[PDB]
């Protein structure tokens, strides 16, 4: 136990702030940082068992090799609380790590380095170098469309895919979809992985926007990113991520262009008087004009009229204004293009001046109105489940629930709005379970059960 | 148009005005202060009144109200209504800079237009909007905004948070001679500050609730308009430019800071504020998370600060101070000391000591306008002295049990005096002191009153079981 080093506070700060990223404590040692002195390099490692961040620091002042682990937040808070220009002397003593700087002495408790978890090494299948700005672009373009604590864990992450000369990101939560692709100047093998949420955040955090390039390595179950003296490694998420190609409108035949800023501020004002639960707003598009309207159960109303570029047929179409605003914020461009097919068909939004990013939002139709799903929900069903569904189909249709039955599968294509704005992966199998218990199907009873159970 | 009652309704809903967005923003922000609370629907609304050539905006939460006057330089019609505050403000804020906002009423709705943006807001009758009961001031005076800002910022941090003693959650405003004074305390630490305001004032002592203090701070614009204050028996009012703030006062027996200040500090220590703060801040990192205790070792022109935690981690800071006198060791809750040092914002700090078991006064070395009291921490259980001895009414039965149990309680670090029908707690062990003894002790006394024997071990077990 004789690791030792002395470093100027300035050189230690940024690496410490960085490796305290993977860091409510999960388990004791995961709140600690692994410190390794080897050669003339100090290595700092932070991990949460799903990912790890390693930071290297060159040591010019005297040092002895060794390794230990110390509380991350405490060690960092001490360094940060010392004056600018200060010197930080570290030294192991027994089961304690001593930190000195001037007449400030600190004794921290340690846990052995040999107990610090390692990631089992792996083999990269893909390797490429790209500018930091490019990676930051790809993530910021799609990050907001990631799911949050979905039961489908693969949606809580971000798809990274290499195709030809391009790196692509995809994110969706089942209600909306963000896709962005950028060239990276070299032919790559076809690969497709899901990076979990925390990893994407951490990946974004290690990028300073600098012109020094990012080195990426992708294996089957791990991804590794090297920038400057930082090395980020993360586990990948398994699961069948949906295919963005099927989500894009088949063929838009109507398109409008508008100033991003004006359209966004207009939607933002309208949203104030939209339903707080469903957040619907109406668009009426006509020649070179757009009329946005919103109202709520208190029958308050907002109306916005903008000049736009549009020469298609007039059309009325509703949206979740929160999803539209999310897209317009992420774009941050001059003009936006909205590609439309018809109400009841998915809408595609892009920067008017570039096709690198594309966004998909489902319209809101306005007995009960059947709202189309972003992605049709396909579910395996037993003979008994199937029979219950077929008996209840017409009763379900009256509630706005449309579906198709294959041999041993059902495909939900539409549901009423209150269900669509929730997780159908959870709700529909509950609905199926409930239906299998019945022999007589009426819309009233079903509606009442859904109303009291699926909400 | 021809219906007579229908005509009266139209004359009732004539309110109309047109104002620049930038003339409306700061006033809407200001009056939305007292307000996401679903307390009552009407309380989420602003009152709008066009009278004379002035638009008045009023927001309230029934404990206080903020009124803003806006001069109307464009055509307008008199009238009144109420509209949802957050919505109306978000609409105005969301409109482009330089926008003209035209408002008028149509039935039970308020219409807002600007360019080609139209909004329809639901209203509630102005008649239903609460009006604070009229009252008469007993004291009027004016002072610079910066002085009020100083008085409040010097003491605000020491106010209790959600204490069951509501008077501790507010701030004492006191007029004495030519000075305005603020006092705040949570039973554990105390902040007092006084400023001369250049005029003789009648003696007065009121408690402004926390929300009132915050609002009072929010209406100070660092401009050069003076602040005109009115204090009544049960209300306070503050006028700044186009804003009038009114607040109900809190009643209760606020502690006397005169008694909390150390009687006669025979030792003093001076030190650079920033140096001292940074030393404490670093030492704090390795102090007990619950008790936050650090030790001072004072010697000739040297201060050593130490801290350790249950994991036996350890911090030490040695810095140069100005000090002549006997060596002494004293302990503090570092969080309270760090609060004080952050509030001082000065070059040098004076620390007036006497000993442990005695309150410690802290000041700007160059200014005595503000003073801060913290109680030392002593590390038979150590008896930690209370900032304010707790005087409790006791029944004959309760007093009898206390007399019997006094020796046992003393072993637990609980010290108290007793007088005809009262008992005065002067000290308790540390875990009790850092809690609310106004709740805990009357409970404990209830317990002791129901007991046959008094063994310190048993009582200590009970306390730890029920009072923590």
**What is the rounded distance in angstroms from the CA atom of residue A280 to the CA atom of residue A267?**
11
In this structure, chain B runs to a length of 468
The answer to whether residues A178 and A142 touch, using CB atoms and an 8 Å cutoff, is yes
Of A109, A273, A306, the CB nearest to B312: A109
A74/B116 Cβ within 8 A: no
Structure tokens at B143: 């002072």
Among candidate residues B347, B344, B400, B411, the one with its CA nearest the CA of residue B372: B344
CA-nearest of B344, B361, B343 to B352 is B361
Shortest distance between the Cα of A86 and any Cα of chain B, in A, equals: 13
Q: Shortest Cα distance from A84 to chain B (angstroms)?
A: 12
CB contact under 8 A, B279 and A74: no
Return d(Cα B410, Cα B429) in angstroms, integer: 10
Per-residue exposure over A275-305, b if at least 16 CB sit within 10 Å of its own CB, e if not: eeebbbbbbebeeebbbbbbbbeeebbbbbb
Query: Which residues lie closer than 8 Å to B336 by C-beta, 6 or more apart?
Result: B188, B189, B374
For the record, the structure tokens of B178 come out as: 């030519």
Tell if the CB–CB gap between B119 and A83 is shorter than 8 Å. no
| Partners of residue A269 in chain B, C-beta under 8 Å | 91, 94-95, 117, 119
Chain B CB contacts of A301 below 8 Å = 118-120
Contacts of B315 in chain A (CB under 8 A): 104-107
Whether B248 contacts B160, CB under 8 Å:
no
Read off φ and ψ for residue B21, nearest 5 degrees: -50, -40
* Residues B104 and B111 sit within 8 Å (Cβ to Cβ): yes
Name which of B262, B270, B215, B222 is nearest B237 in CA terms.
B215
Which residues in chain B are classed under CATH 3.10.150.10? Answer: 4-128, 139-255, 261-374
The answer to whether A293 and B110 have CB atoms below 8 angstroms apart is no
Cα B166 from Cα B173, distance rounded (Å): 15
Tell me how far apart the alpha carbons of residues A444 and B466 are, in angstroms, rounded to a whole number.
54
Query: Into which CATH architecture does domain B384-466 fall?
Result: 2-Layer Sandwich (3.30)
Q: What is the least distance, in Å, from the CA of B216 to any CA of chain A?
A: 29
Rounded to whole angstroms, the Cα distance separating A282 from B309 reads 60
Cβ partners under 8 Å of residue A348, min gap 6: A248, A249, A252, A338, A339, A358, A359, A360
Q: Give the integer Cα–Cα distance in Å for A86 and A20.
A: 21
Best residue in B114, B118, B281 for a mutation probing chain A (most A CBs within 10 Å): B118
Alpha carbon of residue A59 to chain centroid: 38
Q: Does domain A248-361 have CATH number 3.10.150.10?
A: yes
Asked if A104 and B281 come within 8 Å (Cβ–Cβ), the reply is no
Most B CBs within 10 A among A104, A258, A259, hence the mutation to make, goes to A104
Please judge whether B315 and A105 are an interchain contact, meaning their C-beta atoms are less than 8 angstroms apart: yes
Q: Does residue A106 come out as left (phi exceeding 0), alpha (psi in the -120 to 50 range) or beta?
A: beta
Which residue of B83, B117, B274, B283 to mutate against A (max A Cβ within 10 Å)?
B117
Which ranges in A292-339 belong to alpha helices (H)? 321-331
Comparing alpha-carbon positions, the chain B residue that sits nearest to A101 is B317
Distance CA B399, CA B461 (A): 22
The Cα B196–Cα A148 span in angstroms is 57
The distance of B318 to chain A (nearest Cα, Å) reads 6
Task: Give the three-class secondary structure for A370.
Answer: strand
Determine the residue of chain B that is closest to A295 in CA distance: B120
Measured between beta carbons, the chain A residues lying within 8 angstroms of B282 are 78, 81-82, 104, 106
Judged by CB atoms closer than 8 Å, whether chains meet at A74 and B286 is answered as yes
Identify the closest residue of chain B to A273 by CA–CA distance.
B87
Lookup: tokens for A352:
């008017």
Architecture of the domain delimited by A370-453: 2-Layer Sandwich (3.30)
List every span in chain B annotated with CATH 3.30.1370.100.
384-466
Q: Which CATH architecture group holds A4-115?
A: Roll (3.10)
Q: Which one of A78, A261, A272, A297 would you mutate to disrupt binding with B, by most B Cβ within 10 Å of its Cβ?
A: A272
A205 labeled binding residue: no
Residue B139 near residue B204, CB atoms below 8 Å: yes
Closest CA to A318 of A261, A279, A359, A268: A279
Contacts of B397 (CB under 8 A, 6+ apart): B449
HEC states along chain A?
CCCEEEEEHHHHHHHHHHHCCCCCCCCHHHHEEEEEEECCEEEEEEECCCEEEEEEEECCCCCECEEEEEEHHHHHHHHHHCCCCCEEEEEEECCEEEEEECCEEEEEECECHHHCCCCCCCCCCEEEEECHHHHHHHHHHHHHHCCCCCCCHHHCEEEEEEEEEEEEEEEECCCEEEEEEEEEEEEEEEEEEEEEHHHHHHHHHHCCCCCCCEEEEECCCEEEEEECCEEEEEECECCCCCCHHHHCCCCCCEEEEEEHHHHHHHHHHHHCCCCCCCCEEEEEEECCEEEEEEECCCCCEEEEEEECECCCCCEEEEEEHHHHHHHHHHHCCCEEEEEECCCCCCEEEEECCCCCEEEEECCECCCCCEEEEEEEEEEECCHHHHHHHHHHHHHHHCCCCEEEECCCEEEEEEEEHHHHCCCHHHHHHHHHHHHCCCCCCCHHHHHHHHHHHCC
For chain A, the residues whose C-beta falls within 8 A of a C-beta of chain B are 74, 77-78, 81-83, 96, 103-109, 265-266, 268-269, 272-273, 298-306
**Tokens of residue A195, six digits:** 């990076």
Mutate to test the interface with B, among A262, A284, A301 (most CBs of B within 10 A): A301
Which of B227, B252, B203 has the alpha carbon at shortest distance from B151? B227
CB distance A269–B91 less than 8 Å? yes
- The first and second tokens of residue B31, run together, are 């009056």
Residue corresponding to tokens 């041993």: A408
Q: To the nearest whole angstrom, how far is the Cα of B282 from the nearest Cα of chain A?
A: 6
Residue in chain A nearest B116 by alpha carbon:
A305
Identify the DSSP state of B96: P
Q: Is B410 strand, coil or helix?
A: helix
What are the chain B neighbours of A299 within 8 Å (beta carbons)?
Answer: 120, 122
A77 contacts in B (CB within 8 Å)?
Answer: 285
Q: Which residues of A touch B286 (CB under 8 A)?
A: 74, 106-108
| Encoded tokens for B378 | 């002593």
Indicate yes or no: CB of B87 within 8 angstroms of CB of A304.
no
Neighbour count for residue B329 (Cβ, 10 Å): 16
Q: Which fold has domain B4-128?
A: DNA Polymerase III; Chain A, domain 2 (3.10.150)
Given this structure, which CATH class describes domain B261-374?
Answer: alpha beta
Q: Where in chain A is the domain with CATH 3.30.1370.100?
A: 370-453
Residue B199 tokens, joined: 């005029």
Asked if residue A356 lies in contact with residue A378, where contact means CB atoms within 8 angstroms, the answer is no
Strands (E), A249-346: 254-259, 280-286, 289-295, 301-307, 315-320, 335-340
Location of each CATH 3.10.150.10 domain in chain A: 4-115, 126-242, 248-361
- Rounded Cα distance between B214 and A114, Å, is 53
Nearest neighbour of B311 by CB, restricted to A82, A109, A266:
A109
Which residue of B45, B113, B115, B286 is the best one to mutate when testing the A interface, meaning the one whose CB has the most A CBs within 10 A? B286
> Nearest by CB to A268, which of B94, B279, B318?
B94
Rounded to 5°, the CA angle B22-B23-B29 comes to: 80
Determine the distance in angstroms separating the CA of B112 from the nearest CA of chain A, rounded to an integer: 9
Q: Is A24 annotated to bind ligand? A: yes
Torsion of CA A380, A382, A384, A390, to 10 degrees: 30
Contact A239, A152 (CB under 8 A): yes
Rounded CA separation B39/B55 (Å): 26
Residue A424 makes CB contacts below 8 A (sequence gap 6+) with A174, A373, A377, A412, A415
CB contact under 8 A, B278 and A83: yes
Token look-up 């360019």 returns B115
CA separation, residue A198 to residues A22, A48, A204, A232, B121 (Å): 8, 10, 10, 12, 42
Using the beta-carbon criterion (under 8 Å), do B91 and A306 form an inter-chain contact?
A: no
Do A106 and B316 make contact, defined as CB atoms within 8 angstroms? Answer: yes
B118/A83 CB distance under 8 A: no
| Beta-carbon separation of B94 and A300 below 8 A | no
- Residues of A with Cβ-Cβ distance to B321 under 8 angstroms: none
Nearest CA in chain A to B320: A103
Task: Rounding to the nearest 10 degrees, give the CA dihedral for residues B327, B333, B334, B340.
Answer: -100
Residues of B within an 8 Å Cβ radius of A: 87, 90-91, 94-96, 109, 116-122, 278-279, 281-282, 285-286, 311-319
Q: Which CATH number applies to A126-242: 3.10.150.10, 3.40.50.300, 3.90.1580.10, 3.40.47.10? A: 3.10.150.10
B293 and B332 in contact (C-beta within 8 Å)?
yes
Give resolution in angstroms: 2.2
Fold of B139-255: DNA Polymerase III; Chain A, domain 2 (3.10.150)
First to last CA, chain A: 58
What count of other Cβ atoms lies within 10 Å of the Cβ of residue B43?
17
Residues A275, A280, A285, CA angle at the centre, nearest 5°?
Answer: 140
A77–B119 C-beta distance less than 8 A: no
Annotated binding site of B for DNA: 37, 86, 162, 166-167
Structure tokens at B246: 């009114």
Technique used by the depositors: X-ray
Cα first-last separation, chain B: 71
Of A224, A237, A311, A304, the C-alpha closest to A270 is A304
């Amino acid at each position: 136990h004789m690791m030792k080093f002395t470093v100027e506070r300035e050189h230690l700060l940024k690496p410490l702030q960085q490796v305290s990223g993977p860091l409510r404590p999960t388990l004791p040692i995961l709140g600690n940082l692994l410190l390794q002195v080897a050669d003339g390099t100090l290595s700092l490692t932070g991990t949460d068992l799903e990912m790890e961040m390693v930071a290297r620091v060159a040591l010019v002042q005297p040092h002895e090799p060794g390794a230990t682990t110390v509380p991350a937040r405490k060690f960092f808070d001490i360094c940060r609380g010392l004056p600018e220009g200060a010197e930080i002397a570290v030294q192991l003593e027994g089961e304690r790590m001593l930190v000195r700087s001037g007449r400030s002495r600190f004794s921290l408790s340690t846990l052995p380095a040999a107990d610090f978890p390692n990631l089992d090494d792996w083999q990269s299948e893909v390797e490429f170098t790209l500018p930091q700005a490019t990676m930051k672009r790809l993530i910021e373009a799609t990050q907001f469309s990631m799911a949050h604590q979905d039961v489908r864990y693969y949606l809580n992450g971000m798809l990274f895919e290499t195709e030809g000369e391009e790196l692509r990101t995809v994110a969706t939560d089942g209600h909306r979809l963000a896709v962005c692709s950028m060239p990276i100047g070299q032919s790559l093998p076809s690969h497709s992985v899901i990076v979990p949420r925390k990893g994407v955040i951490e990946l974004m955090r290690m990028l300073d926007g600098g012109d020094n390039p990012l080195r990426v390595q992708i294996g089957s179950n791990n991804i590794r990113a090297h920038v400057g003296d930082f090395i980020f490694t993360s586990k990948l998420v398994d699961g069948r991520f949906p295919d963005y190609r099927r989500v894009l409108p088949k063929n838009p035949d109507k398109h409008l262009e508008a100033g991003c800023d004006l359209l966004k501020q207009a939607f933002a004002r309208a949203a104030i008087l939209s339903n707080e639960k469903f957040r619907g707003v109406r668009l009426y598009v006509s020649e070179n004009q757009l009329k946005i309207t919103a109202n709520n159960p208190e029958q308050e109303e907002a109306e916005e009229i903008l000049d736009v570029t549009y020469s298609g047929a007039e059309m009325e179409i509703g949206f979740n204004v929160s999803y539209v605003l999310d897209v317009l914020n992420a774009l941050k461009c001059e003009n936006v293009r909205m590609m439309l097919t018809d109400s009841v068909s998915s809408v595609q939004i892009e920067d008017a001046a570039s096709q690198s990013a594309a966004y998909v939002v489902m319209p809101m139709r306005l007995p009960v109105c059947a709202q189309p799903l972003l992605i049709p929900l396909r579910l395996k069903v037993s003979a008994e489940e199937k029979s219950a569904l077929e008996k209840a189909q017409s009763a379900l249709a009256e509630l706005g629930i449309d579906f198709q039955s294959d041999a041993q599968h059902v495909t939900i294509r539409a549901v009423p709005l209150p269900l669509r704005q929730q997780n159908l992966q959870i709700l529909i199998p509950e609905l199926i379970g409930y239906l299998a218990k019945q022999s007589v199907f009426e819309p009233g009873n079903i509606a009442q059960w859904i109303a009291r159970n699926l909400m």
